[PDB]
Amino acid sequence: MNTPEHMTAVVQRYVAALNAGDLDGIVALFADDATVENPVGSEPRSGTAAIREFYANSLKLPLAVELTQEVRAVANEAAFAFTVSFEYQGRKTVVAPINHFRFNGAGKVVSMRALFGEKNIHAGA
Amino acid sequence: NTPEHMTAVVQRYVAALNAGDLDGIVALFADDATVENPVGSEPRSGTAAIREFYANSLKLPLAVELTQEVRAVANEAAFAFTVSFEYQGRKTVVAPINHFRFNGAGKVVSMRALFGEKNIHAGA
Ligand SMILES: C[C@]12CCC(=O)C=C1CC[C@@H]1[C@@H]2CC[C@]2(C)C(=O)CC[C@@H]12
Ligand SMILES: C[C@]12CCCC=C1CC[C@@H]1[C@@H]2CC[C@]2(C)C(=O)CC[C@@H]12
């Protein structure tokens, strides 16, 4: 089933799910033995339980998430630029990563990696 | 590798494509680096092949421009950009996202360029 059209749709779904705080729908996009490496450089989380815990932890504050450019999708991989916004104690932060998804034949994500650093975290005092 | 180093290297890449400075591009890479253009394709490997690649890439003048901030962390960077060229009166703009991994010496050990057909923007 995996096509560039499918992978683009999955990226759009992943954004929508984060927006909604929908753990079931985020985790559903992943293969059972997938990895999540967030940020790049950290120990990968491996398999459904670990992936759900990771997203649960990321979702404790409501996130407003938005693609900021066209999805790049080719072969069996996709990359996307987006922002994740949240508020805590009256301060708004906007984080701007680039994520990479690798997909299996069935169109499930087998690996996510998220590149961002301190310069991509935008907050006032 | 500081994020500032890796960000600067990305800007150097962009500047050297703009300037058609083939030395300038190839110098960013490790001895034994790979370039995958597009992501799904067999990589060019080693200095000679990487140079050949970029020589072919510079047959037409290119206009290249970062379209967002660089993301750099650990020993890796990713960047959203455009590269435009003009051929027989038509302009094409390709909008990839590229990934570089850097070695301890701060040289690029791999590039991948992720763009698909929907990232190639051209009229008639
Ligand atoms: C995990 C995450 C969402 C899922 C995704 O795809 C990419 C990211 C990267 C930035 C994370 C964010 C979740 C909320 C985080 C932890 C913050 O409060 C600061 C950094 C930010
Ligand atoms: C300019 C380029 C080679 C010549 C013909 C067509 C091309 C399209 C996409 C370009 C490629 C050169 C290298 C490039 C700028 C990347 O680093 C990503 C997109 C590539």
Curated annotation (Swiss-Prot), chain A:
Keywords annotated in UniProt: Isomerase, Lipid metabolism, Steroid metabolism
GO molecular function, one term: steroid Delta-isomerase activity
Root EC class: isomerase
Active site: Y14, N38
GO biological process, one term: steroid metabolic process
E.C. number(s) listed in UniProt: 5.3.3.1
Identification of the protein by name: Steroid Delta-isomerase
Reactions mediated catalytically: a 3-oxo-Delta(5)-steroid = a 3-oxo-Delta(4)-steroid
Record's keyword annotation contains Ribonucleoprotein: no
Impact after mutating P39A: Perturbs active site geometry and lowers activity
Induction: By steroids.
Transmembrane segments annotated in the record for this chain: none
Record: residues binding substrate: N99
Quaternary assembly: Homodimer.
Keyword Isomerase found: yes
Cystine pairings recorded for this chain: none
